[PDB]
């Protein structure tokens, strides 16, 4: 029998907070899949959400699939090149759509992120079913701040905008929460299939992504929890990663960069709103546990689960921007906040607020990397992930092979017995996978997927990498690097401290060779003006 699909994605988790990844977040039901399957410590995605879903769906880059850039900050520069759409293009083909033509029925609930129009929706790229959160965020309780001229750019680009199927919706239910409103409808589609046909079921959550937003009864679970702040979490999750084997107990964790105040330096009324916010995070994430354990547990009264290839993955690094601190998203998001909002203690976390935990919090989860989400650094791209699928031989462990979120469609297709097209499709013409199928790896017929000559490009925002093997150089422009290109053993330095550049120059060289084929091969076109901080 041809095995169902169900693929997890957390939006903006980080790697150490489930429970079976070094967290003191409850995530029962995410600890029993990864603990019996496999648990992934070199996987990676991009560095932000839009690129890895394009990714995550076509087996390709970002560039190619028509992410090039996130669409909310696509520039003039920028806007026409190819791969650039700002949506999922036609120069893909997307995995549900080749599924759904070999007998598959195609579920979704949760944030799409590839589209807002009617041709660029879930329905119209290949899911039978499907209830949608169009953009890349949104009130997770559908509360809406005032929309006009005026309204922060970051909150007009993020209204709860979902579609069911080819509907538009015009009201969301009574006691909607996000990731209570994508389990509900996942659960009702499985409950409602054909049970004679295998599923692929995409479950991407909205959680742990800013607006950090959780029911009360689990936020007061974490009371008191986060009171030794983030430094102190850090400590106590690389303590962790080490016992369990996830990171080698002598490794040396990048320093923590943040341009805010450190814990110990504030005032007692604003660390208590900052514990508050991870009180927050730490409820959404043992929620979007539950609603995993709702499909999982359907599942496996059902007789399925056995048979169901289950991959949870978070879509890039921990979220430790601070919103304040881009034009872009404003004008004046915080005086707008202020006049619409109630961040007071006692509201943090209910509809009416609007928090982020900042790159302090964000740090204590992605260490030992290197700096966290939207960088292409370690800390932004290598994400926790599991896979939990019987047949296969390779369960049960901690595996450190290389892999990236461009892998998931070539092995999907695999165990489906589905070969990917080539390069044509519905009469156009279409980019093949960049990854590789991890069929033989899982089986345990090899090591890993990849080897010590694969090499694999990332660029978003301005910044670069480019990794071949375990060696990987990185470019950070100013303000946030040196502007140069900083080569890194990853097998001797996962937190990219110490530059080599000078050392193994030869090395760097051939990094940056293959950093201009990746260029060539996917359509990267870097801007004047990376982003502006201010
Ligand atoms: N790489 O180190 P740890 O031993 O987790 C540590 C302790 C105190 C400050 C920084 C890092
Ligand atoms: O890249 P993110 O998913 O953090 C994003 C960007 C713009 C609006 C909403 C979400
Ligand atoms: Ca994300």
């Not at 990844?21 to 560095?47: Q, V």
């Not at 090039?68 to 997307?94: D, F, I, Q, S």
């Not at 992930?385 to 595996?399: D, K, M």
């Not at 060696?471 to 401290?497: F, H, S």
């Given at each position: 029998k041809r095995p169902n699909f169900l693929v997890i994605v957390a939006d903006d988790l980080g790697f150490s907070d489930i429970g079976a990844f070094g967290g003191e977040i409850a995530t029962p039901n995410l600890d029993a899949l990864a603990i019996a399957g496999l648990r992934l410590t070199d996987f990676h995605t991009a560095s932000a959400a839009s690129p890895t879903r394009s990714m995550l769906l076509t087996g390709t880059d970002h560039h190619i699939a028509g992410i090039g850039t996130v669409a909310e900050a696509l520039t003039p520069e920028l806007e026409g090149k190819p791969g650039y759409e700002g949506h999922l293009n036609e120069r893909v083909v997307a995995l549900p759509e080749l599924l759904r033509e070999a007998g598959y029925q195609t579920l979704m609930a949760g944030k799409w992120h590839l589209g807002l129009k009617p041709e660029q929706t879930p329905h119209a790229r290949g899911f039978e079913r499907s209830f949608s959160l169009l953009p890349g965020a949104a009130n997770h309780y559908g509360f809406e701040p005032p929309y006009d001229e005026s309204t922060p750019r970051i909150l007009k680009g993020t209204p709860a905008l979902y579609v069911e199927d080819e509907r538009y919706l015009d009201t969301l239910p009574e006691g909607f929460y996000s990731s209570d409103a994508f389990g509900d409808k996942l659960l009702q589609y499985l409950?409602?299939?054909?049970?004679?046909?295998?599923?692929?079921?995409?479950?991407?959550?909205?959680?742990?992504?800013?607006?950090?937003?959780?029911?009360?009864?689990?936020?007061?679970?974490?009371?008191?929890?986060?009171?030794?702040?983030?430094?102190?979490?850090?400590?106590?999750?690389?303590?962790?990663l080490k016992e369990l084997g996830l990171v080698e107990a002598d490794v040396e964790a990048h320093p923590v960069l943040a341009l805010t105040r450190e814990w110990e330096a504030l005032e007692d009324e604003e660390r208590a709103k900052s514990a508050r916010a991870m009180e927050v995070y730490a409820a959404m994430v043992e929620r979007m546990d539950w609603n995993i354990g709702r499909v999982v547990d359907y599942l496996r009264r059902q007789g399925e689960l056995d048979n169901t290839f289950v991959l949870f993955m978070s879509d890039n690094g921990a979220e430790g921007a601070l919103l304040e601190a881009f034009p872009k998203f404003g004008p004046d998001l915080l005086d707008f906040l202020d006049r619409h909002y109630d961040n007071s203690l006692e509201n943090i976390g209910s509809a009416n607020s609007y928090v982020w935990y900042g790159p302090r919090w964000?740090?204590?989860?992605?260490?030992?990397?290197?700096?966290?989400?939207?960088?292409?650094?370690?800390?932004?791209?290598?994400?926790?992930?599991?896979?939990?699928?019987?047949?296969?031989?390779?369960?049960?462990?901690?595996?450190?092979?290389?892999?990236?979120?461009?892998?998931?469609?070539?092995?999907?297709?695999?165990?489906?017995?589905?070969?990917?097209?080539?390069?044509?499709?519905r009469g156009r013409e279409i980019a093949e996978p960049r990854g590789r199928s991890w069929l033989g790896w899982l089986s345990g017929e090899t090591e890993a997927a990849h080897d010590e000559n694969t090499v694999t490009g990332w660029g978003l925002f301005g910044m670069r990498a480019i990794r071949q093997g375990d060696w990987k150089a990185v470019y950070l422009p100013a303000p946030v690097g040196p502007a140069t290109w900083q080569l890194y053993d990853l097998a001797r330095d996962p937190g990219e401290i110490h530059d080599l550049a000078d050392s193994q120059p030869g090395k760097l060289a051939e990094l940056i060779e293959h950093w201009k084929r990746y260029v060539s091969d996917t359509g990267v076109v870097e801007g004047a003006s990376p982003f502006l901080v201010r």
């Amino acid at each position: 029998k041809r095995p169902n699909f169900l693929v997890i994605v957390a939006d903006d988790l980080g790697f150490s907070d489930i429970g079976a990844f070094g967290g003191e977040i409850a995530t029962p039901n995410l600890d029993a899949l990864a603990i019996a399957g496999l648990r992934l410590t070199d996987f990676h995605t991009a560095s932000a959400a839009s690129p890895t879903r394009s990714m995550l769906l076509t087996g390709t880059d970002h560039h190619i699939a028509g992410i090039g850039t996130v669409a909310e900050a696509l520039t003039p520069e920028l806007e026409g090149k190819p791969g650039y759409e700002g949506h999922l293009n036609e120069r893909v083909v997307a995995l549900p759509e080749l599924l759904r033509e070999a007998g598959y029925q195609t579920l979704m609930a949760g944030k799409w992120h590839l589209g807002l129009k009617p041709e660029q929706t879930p329905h119209a790229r290949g899911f039978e079913r499907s209830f949608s959160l169009l953009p890349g965020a949104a009130n997770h309780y559908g509360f809406e701040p005032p929309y006009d001229e005026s309204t922060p750019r970051i909150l007009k680009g993020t209204p709860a905008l979902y579609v069911e199927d080819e509907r538009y919706l015009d009201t969301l239910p009574e006691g909607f929460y996000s990731s209570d409103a994508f389990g509900d409808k996942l659960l009702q589609y499985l409950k409602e299939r054909d049970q004679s046909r295998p599923f692929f079921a995409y479950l991407p959550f909205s959680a742990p992504h800013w607006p950090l937003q959780a029911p009360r009864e689990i936020v007061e679970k974490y009371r008191g929890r986060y009171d030794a702040g983030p430094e102190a979490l850090r400590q106590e999750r690389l303590a962790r990663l080490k016992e369990l084997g996830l990171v080698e107990a002598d490794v040396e964790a990048h320093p923590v960069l943040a341009l805010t105040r450190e814990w110990e330096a504030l005032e007692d009324e604003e660390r208590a709103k900052s514990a508050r916010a991870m009180e927050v995070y730490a409820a959404m994430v043992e929620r979007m546990d539950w609603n995993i354990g709702r499909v999982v547990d359907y599942l496996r009264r059902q007789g399925e689960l056995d048979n169901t290839f289950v991959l949870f993955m978070s879509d890039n690094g921990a979220e430790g921007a601070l919103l304040e601190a881009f034009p872009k998203f404003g004008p004046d998001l915080l005086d707008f906040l202020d006049r619409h909002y109630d961040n007071s203690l006692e509201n943090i976390g209910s509809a009416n607020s609007y928090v982020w935990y900042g790159p302090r919090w964000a740090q204590a989860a992605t260490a030992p990397s290197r700096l966290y989400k939207a960088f292409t650094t370690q800390g932004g791209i290598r994400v926790p992930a599991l896979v939990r699928y019987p047949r296969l031989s390779r369960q049960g462990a901690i595996s450190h092979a290389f892999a990236t979120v461009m892998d998931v469609t070539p092995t999907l297709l695999d165990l489906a017995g589905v070969r990917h097209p080539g390069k044509r499709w519905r009469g156009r013409e279409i980019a093949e996978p960049r990854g590789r199928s991890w069929l033989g790896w899982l089986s345990g017929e090899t090591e890993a997927a990849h080897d010590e000559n694969t090499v694999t490009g990332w660029g978003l925002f301005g910044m670069r990498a480019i990794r071949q093997g375990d060696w990987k150089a990185v470019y950070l422009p100013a303000p946030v690097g040196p502007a140069t290109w900083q080569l890194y053993d990853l097998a001797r330095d996962p937190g990219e401290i110490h530059d080599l550049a000078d050392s193994q120059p030869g090395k760097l060289a051939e990094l940056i060779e293959h950093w201009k084929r990746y260029v060539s091969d996917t359509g990267v076109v870097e801007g004047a003006s990376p982003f502006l901080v201010r």
